[PDB]
């Protein structure tokens, strides 16, 4: 009966779909995630801002932003690296926002920065955001390359 | 028509599973699954024995257990830091038994421990096992923090 | 309601489907493949050259091949010690080729190497290639192990 047939098939569905959630959640235990919290991964290649977004995007993530301390420091031990941050001015110099929309509501840049510099000679000034190796942040050509770091959600 | 567009969706649906059974080898592969053996996994997060043990079973893993010299260095290098093994003698004080079930067939037991100890001042005394330094058990309360390290079947 | 019925697995298999392939890209991203290169992945398990090979046969990859100094380096990276390279002359004596066919181009041989030894008294002569600490190559017996390394396309 083809009834019964599409009824056994509709439950091998769901017990796939079941088992594809247990591979993402091991995967995501084996990669460090944290009980509720969000999950940062890098391949270590660097790369443009542009780059990045795609890369991210592709995955179904989005680059790392960190929305407190903790975030940054775990975005900062993942990359081990300098490190492009979803966060940029290029809309309106000055204003930096999320990549995903809004406001700054936390950020760690250095004493004399973001500087918006000109003198990097890649033309035009400087709307994205990267991280150093202390943690600290500096706005930085988009046409540089950076290591990439994609967030997901907790 | 029908019957047809049936049987291909069985075949989609082998496919898939197919698919998945290689996709979960390559990703025990990368999380250093040794041929024909049980292999550990830590997302290095620190919680309560309780956690531990709530965590692995999510990932339909058991908490992980050595049962011999080698298996106790693999936790180890996997875990880096101190972790809980899935030995407890709750059931019957003084009495260290699997979570799976079962008396013990192999132990590492540092000097003076077991000793059931209620100083740390947590409440009770200790009823769950962890390992320190060179790899020795020591016996702790289930309530301090350790390291997670969850165990899949060879 | 039958076609219905039909018509939702249709779309249940297909985004089941996308999102395997998600699950792929994320972990190939997560054991560090660069964007069009191919990748090399191990679980540092040393084993005779034929079952290097079954190993990764059984993963849809291969023994992993340096096709230039950049992947010779990637290789080592990944591996940390001495790997079997998908490299050997078993067809014919003194003319090595790719597992995957082909005779050898790039090489990075150790000085004096390669030199058919037989002096190691497991039987025969040396048809395997492996890559050494500092990324040279030396031609051994296939039947000594040395850690597996697989490759995937790029
Ligand atoms: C990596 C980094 O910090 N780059 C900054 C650059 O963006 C610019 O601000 C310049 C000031 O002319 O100083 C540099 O240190
Ligand atoms: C030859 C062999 O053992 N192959 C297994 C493979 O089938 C799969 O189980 C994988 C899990 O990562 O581990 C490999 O060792
Ligand atoms: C981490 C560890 O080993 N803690 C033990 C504690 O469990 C208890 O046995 C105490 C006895 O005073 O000694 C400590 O060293
Ligand atoms: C690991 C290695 O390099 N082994 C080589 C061996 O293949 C053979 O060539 C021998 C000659 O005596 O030298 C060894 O160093
Ligand atoms: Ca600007
Ligand atoms: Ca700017
Ligand atoms: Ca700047
Ligand atoms: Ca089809
Ligand atoms: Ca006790
Ligand atoms: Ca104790
Ligand atoms: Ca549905
Ligand atoms: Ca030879
Ligand atoms: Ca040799
Ligand atoms: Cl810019
Ligand atoms: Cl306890
Ligand atoms: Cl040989």
Redesign the interface.
């Known amino acids: 009966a ?2 019964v ?2 009824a056994n ?2 439950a ?2 769901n017990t ?2 079941s ?2 959630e ?14 509720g919290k969000k999950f940062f ?1 890098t ?3 660097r ?1 443009p801002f542009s ?1 990045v977004k795609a ?1 991210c995007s ?4 989005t680059v790392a932003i960190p929305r407190n301390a903790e975030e940054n420091k775990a975005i900062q031990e993942v990359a081990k690296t300098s490190a492009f941050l979803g966060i940029t001015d290029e809309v309106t110099e000055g204003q930096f926002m999320y990549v995903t929309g809004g406001r700054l509501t936390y950020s760690n840049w250095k004493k004399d920065q973001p500087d918006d510099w000109y003198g990097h000679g890649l033309g035009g000034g400087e709307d994205c955001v990267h991280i150093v190796d202390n943690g600290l942040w500096n706005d930085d050509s988009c046409q540089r390359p950076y290591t990439a770091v ?1 967030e997901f959600p907790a």
Chains 1, 2, 3 share one sequence.
């Open positions: 083809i009834e047939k599409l098939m509709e091998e569905i796939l779909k088992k594809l247990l591979t993402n959640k091991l995967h995501a235990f084996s990669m460090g995630k944290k009980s991964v391949n270590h290649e790369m780059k890369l592709e995955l179904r993530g994609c």
